[PDB]
């Protein structure tokens, strides 16, 4: 269908421009800061999302079978969990650190240093790994039918399955979503009050939150529906429908390079300096 063209465009942009961001933020060209360190971490997470998710989730839907093996399935499941958790927690980290940089700027002058940026980045990566240990512990590949492999997430008790599902839902979508929403609302409010074209980038601060919910809501809602409903949840969301839902999520990995980095002129100047 049309899914393959959109997956190809999103892969092309979200690998090309994202690796360009990783290259530019790699060598310090006087435009690397605390928030640029957080953008480097988010770019690594989104590149891992782009290279680990979309060809490896499209094919179980586009071909209907999992060509790869069980150890590949578990490693890609670890990549799934670590990349989604690091991407959401890194977005929240950029939100909270902008909330410290513009609201209460003296505390930013006190403790907003690159050492703190590295400490927070390492903390989110380690927490993501620890929380998503059960993701390759329990992604046992089961032959579904005669000769079809699907990488089912078998859990020992159902109660554990929906308990972990709601744990993921609150700890990666609900609480991170409300934290980033509150943080950028406070940034917009103190932009209006504390200090005009900044009122015009309040539009960008709005899209960073409402578009984030728009991109990331169907994935978590579908997975929660899978967790409780069980039998029959797959039949409504198999094929192209779910293969578009994840595309919205990967559109998130498509829009993160465009908004923080590519929109502003400073990164264009960094691009010119790199050349």
């Amino acid at each position: 269908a049309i899914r393959i063209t959109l997956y190809a465009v999103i892969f092309l942009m979200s690998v090309g421009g994202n690796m360009l961001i990783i290259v530019v933020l790699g060598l310090s060209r006087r435009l690397r800061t605390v928030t640029n360190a957080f953008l480097l971490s988010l770019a690594v997470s989104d590149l891992l999302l782009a290279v680990a998710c979309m060809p490896f989730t499209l094919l179980p839907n586009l071909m209907g079978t999992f060509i790869f093996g069980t150890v590949i399935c578990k490693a890609v499941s670890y990549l799934m969990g670590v990349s989604v958790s690091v991407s959401t927690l890194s977005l929240v980290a950029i939100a909270l650190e902008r909330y410290s940089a513009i609201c209460r700027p003296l505390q930013a002058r006190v403790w907003q240093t690159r050492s703190h940026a590295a400490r927070v980045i390492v903390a989110t990566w380690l927490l993501s790994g620890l929380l998503m240990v059960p993701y390759p512990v329990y992604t046992v590949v089961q032959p579904v039918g005669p000769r079809v492999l699907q990488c089912v997430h078998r859990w020992p008790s159902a109660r554990v399955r929906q308990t972990w599902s709601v744990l993921l839902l609150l700890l990666l979508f609900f609480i991170p979503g409300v934290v980033m929403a509150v943080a950028y609302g406070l940034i917009s409010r103190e932009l209006y009050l504390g200090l005009l074209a900044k009122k015009r980038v309040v539009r960008m601060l709005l899209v960073i939150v409402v578009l984030f919910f728009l991109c990331w809501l169907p994935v978590y809602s579908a997975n929660t529906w899978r967790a409780f409903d069980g039998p029959g949840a797959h039949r409504a969301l198999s094929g192209a429908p779910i293969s578009f839902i994840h595309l919205l999520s990967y559109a998130s990995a498509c829009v993160n390079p465009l908004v923080y980095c590519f929109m502003h002129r400073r990164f264009r100047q960094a691009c010119l300096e790199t050349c």
Partner: peptide
């Protein structure tokens, strides 16, 4: 295509992300 379930009422999950 690729019906994650390929059967009826098997409750066989799919990749969350």
């Amino acid at each position: 295509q690729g019906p994650w379930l390929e059967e009826e009422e098997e409750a066989y999950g799919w990749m969350d992300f």
